[PDB]
Design a protein around this ligand. Structure first.
Ligand SMILES: O=C1NC(=O)/C(=C/c2ccc3c(c2)OC(F)(F)O3)S1
Length: 812
């Protein structure tokens, strides 16, 4: 169409990148992938009931946790249907709740303020909103609303020769000894390895040398990088030996490399988009090779095996371990927790060994019959595995996750796509399907993919191709929403940057001029999709106090049925890599969920945090909170240290009645406990102060994501009810929690270890493929007993009490 490229313009703008360019590719994997993604899309758009879709019910299946049952150990729940109030049972479908208020079905129980319909054949107690209400001890509130017109959700239609490589040379516009080290990799595991003679290092360098590897053209497994690096390690680049059609790479190539400043960036098929000042490498791949496509173990070794298949995912495998693990393939193949180690003990450098492997996978029943382990399913999707079949079973076990869990793991999964050898993968296609199936999962997919496309040259093209596929299947409604969301931010970030260049005088001046006619009618809060936003309470927008000059904006709720005058806060900031916070906040919701399995609870406060571009993004404003210092600053501050009894007064003072003060201290121990266990494990316990806040309601929470395990300042202890070497009745509950929460995590050592490791490889700069990760093994005290550890954390608890303020004063 001569108007079709206008839609594409719509996409391009939503995406933030152009999946139509081609000045930075050397094949058609991206295109072929766009072409290939159409089937997965249709297969989903089509297989999706327009009814429940357009309404996106949000339910769970996990058993209702104790703490929330206790708050209703009387089997009774009232649902105020807009003001005739009803009382339902923890087992009544939205219909039963419709039976009452009514005694034609063109009505649906929507929620006041948000976009959260309590529709669908689901048990009342199985609605996230309902449980949220139970959590916040609030009261449910619906509204006789007419079910949404899905029409708006219509998707606009449409040889045995040894491998050799020729290294011509490297060119750079503007820059000693330097060599090129080609490496035939697979699973981030080097195989062969050939180099070059250390010639001079200048703007141009010709070697014209063929590099004859040992691996035979056959031995080459699909998904084996041709890693080219330059040493004097300054620049690197990769090439997929076998391309997306199983064919083998053959030809002349001129690759533009990435410069170094371990991590997931070093894995990419993408070349540098900046051919203006980036290093170049010339290589030649000329050829005419063409593509392709019992008994009983003893009794002492089996023990050796079970021992191995029982250690953490970190524990390295000795050459001995491996040879053993593979010789007993069919036994190791019985224990699922053995897959990772087992498939990491395969020699992909041998068509024959690999051959067996594949024929070994067809014999997997115990696996596809065993209980789904996310921590184990995740280990199979990391950097250590580059084989389609290996990774596919893992993706097959994920296909079982209900939405609630596909959201609890979305970010980490979307980040895992950086470990996929090719753009079209079961994982991407999996993300794609669940995106289109549920609008909630789709909304976050959108922003998770966008954050990367906006700052990852390394992974933007591939991500830009997975989003496009999504933006063309979600419906016309959403596409409008995303357009409105993207506008607001692109604008608001401009304001943010300006006000940083230097205030409150030109602040509202610029703000006010913004609402004028730019700021849309009502936009969706990117971190909480079920909340619209209108004009800004300009008279409330400011600029926080700090070297960083974040923007404290507050909007009004564009909703009438909303039973409150409450505002929608939003903190925009430039200067921090909010992509490390998102990941850390994600891990937090995971522990905030693990604990639930054991009905435990720590009242964590993971606020919304959505990256948006380079060193910038949005943050959620947590109502009625204050930074730990601002409290100990009104009284002291400046050059003065702190006050022991300041914080405790801040609670009783900042809380009416006595029925509110103790609560404010009750929910203060759990929260204190929660962030101590959490940060301790996450290895980020040594935090200053302005980086730690608490609510007038008692909930404390960290922010901005000679030593100590964590911050439990005497104040916290004070509030608990202890001056020092003692033990208040609450300090006990504190411990009665911590250990019960800390040991509840050890129950997932493997999971926390696989996420931690993945977080570092795709969230931080360069990553210590060794240490930095082993830190979590230590913290969780892997291997020891349900006691040595319990004491371990306690000794930690001590050091924090033993040091009073040793660092709080230092932090300079
Ligand atoms: O400059 C900053 N960099 C960050 O990462 C910040 C985090 C933060 C998150 C939630 C909050 C908050 C602050 O104060 C609040 F009460 F608004 O609730 S502030």
């Amino acid at each position: 169409s001569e108007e079709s490229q206008a839609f594409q313009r719509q996409l391009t703008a939503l995406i933030g990148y152009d999946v139509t360019d081609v000045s930075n590719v050397h094949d058609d994997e991206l295109e072929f992938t766009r072409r290939g993604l159409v089937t997965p899309r249709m297969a989903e758009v089509a297989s999706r009931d327009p009814k429940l879709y357009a309404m996106h019910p949000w339910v769970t299946s996990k058993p209702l946790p104790e703490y929330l049952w206790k708050k209703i150990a009387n089997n009774c729940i009232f649902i105020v249907i807009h003001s005739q109030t009803i009382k339902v049972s923890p087992d009544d479908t939205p219909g039963a709740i419709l039976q009452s208020f009514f005694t034609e079905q063109d009505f649906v129980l929507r929620v006041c303020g948000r976009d959260e319909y309590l529709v669908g054949e689901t048990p009342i107690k199985n609605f996230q909103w309902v449980r949220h209400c139970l959590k916040n001890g609030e009261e449910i509130h619906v509204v006789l609303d007419t079910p949404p017109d899905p029409a708006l959700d219509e998707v606009r239609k449409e040889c045995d020769r040894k491998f050799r490589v020729k290294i011509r040379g490297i060119d750079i516009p503007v820059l000693l000894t330097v060599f090129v080290e080609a490496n035939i990799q697979h699973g981030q595991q080097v195989l062969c390895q050939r180099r070059t003679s250390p010639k001079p290092f200048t703007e141009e360098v010709l070697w014209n040398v063929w590099l004859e590897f040992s691996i035979k053209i056959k031995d080459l497994p699909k998904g084996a990088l041709l890693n080219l690096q330059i040493y004097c390690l300054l620049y690197y680049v990769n090439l997929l030996l076998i391309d997306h059609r199983f064919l083998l790479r053959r030809g002349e190539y001129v690759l533009h490399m990435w410069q170094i400043s371990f991590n997931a960036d070093k894995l990419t098929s993408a070349t540098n988009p900046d051919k203006e000042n980036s290093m170049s490498i010339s290589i030649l791949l000329d050829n005419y090779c063409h593509p392709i496509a019992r008994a009983e173990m003893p009794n002492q070794l089996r023990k050796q095996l079970e021992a191995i298949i029982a250690t953490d995912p970190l524990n390295p495998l000795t050459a001995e371990d491996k040879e053993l693990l593979w010789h007993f393939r069919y036994e190791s193949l019985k224990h699922p927790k053995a897959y990772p180690k087992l498939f990491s003990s395969v020699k992909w450098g041998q068509q024959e060994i690999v051959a067996k492997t594949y024929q070994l996978l067809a014999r997997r029943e115990v696996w596809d019959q065993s209980a789904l382990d996310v921590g184990l399913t995740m280990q199979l999707l990391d950097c250590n595995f580059s084989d389609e079949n290996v990774r596919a079973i893992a993706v097959q076990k994920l296909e079982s996750l209900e939405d609630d869990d596909v959201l609890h793991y979305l970010l980490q999964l979307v980040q895992a796509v950086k470990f996929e050898p090719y753009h079209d993968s079961a994982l991407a296609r999996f993300l794609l399907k669940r995106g289109l199936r549920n609008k909630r999962i789709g909304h976050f997919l959108f922003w998770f993919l966008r954050s990367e496309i906006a700052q990852s040259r390394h992974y933007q093209q591939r991500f830009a191709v997975i989003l496009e596929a999504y933006l063309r299947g979600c419906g016309t409604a959403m596409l409008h929403d995303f357009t409105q969301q993207v506008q607001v931010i692109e604008m608001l970030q401009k304001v943010t940057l300006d006000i940083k260049s230097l205030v409150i005088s030109q602040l509202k001046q610029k703000l006010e001029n913004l609402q004028n006619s730019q700021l849309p009618e009502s936009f969706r809060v990117p971190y909480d999709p079920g909340l619209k936003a209108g004009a800004l309470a300009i008279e409330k927008c400011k600029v926080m106090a700090s070297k960083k000059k974040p923007l404290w904006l507050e909007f009004k709720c564009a909703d009438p049925t909303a039973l409150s005058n409450e505002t929608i806060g939003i903190i925009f900031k430039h200067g921090d890599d909010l992509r490390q916070d998102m990941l850390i906040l994600q891990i937090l919701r995971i522990m905030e969920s693990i604990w639930e399995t054991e009905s435990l609870d720590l009242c964590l406060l993971p606020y919304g945090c959505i990256s948006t571009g380079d060193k910038i993004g949005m943050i959620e404003i947590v109502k009625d909170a204050t930074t730990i210092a601002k409290i100990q600053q009104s009284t002291v501050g400046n050059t003065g240290a702190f006050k022991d009894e300041v914080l405790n007064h801040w609670l009783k003072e900042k809380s009416p009645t006595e029925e509110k003060f103790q609560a404010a201290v009750e929910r203060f121990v759990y929260s204190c406990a929660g962030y101590c266990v959490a940060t301790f494990v996450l290895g980020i316990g040594d935090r200053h102060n302005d980086n730690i806040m608490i609510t007038e309601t008692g909930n404390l929470f960290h922010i901005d994501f000679e030593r100590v395990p964590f911050v439990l300042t005497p104040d916290f202890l004070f509030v608990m009810g202890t001056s020092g070497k003692k033990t208040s009745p609450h300090f006990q509950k504190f411990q009665d929690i911590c250990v019960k929460a800390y040991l509840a995590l050890r129950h997932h050592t493997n999971l926390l270890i696989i996420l931690f490791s993945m977080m570092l490889m795709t969230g931080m700069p360069q990553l210590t493929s060794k240490e930095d990760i082993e830190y979590i093994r230590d913290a969780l005290t892997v291997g020891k007993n349900e006691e040595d550890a319990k004491k371990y954390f306690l000794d930690q608890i001590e050091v924090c009490r033993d040091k009073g303020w040793t660092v709080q004063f230092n932090w300079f």
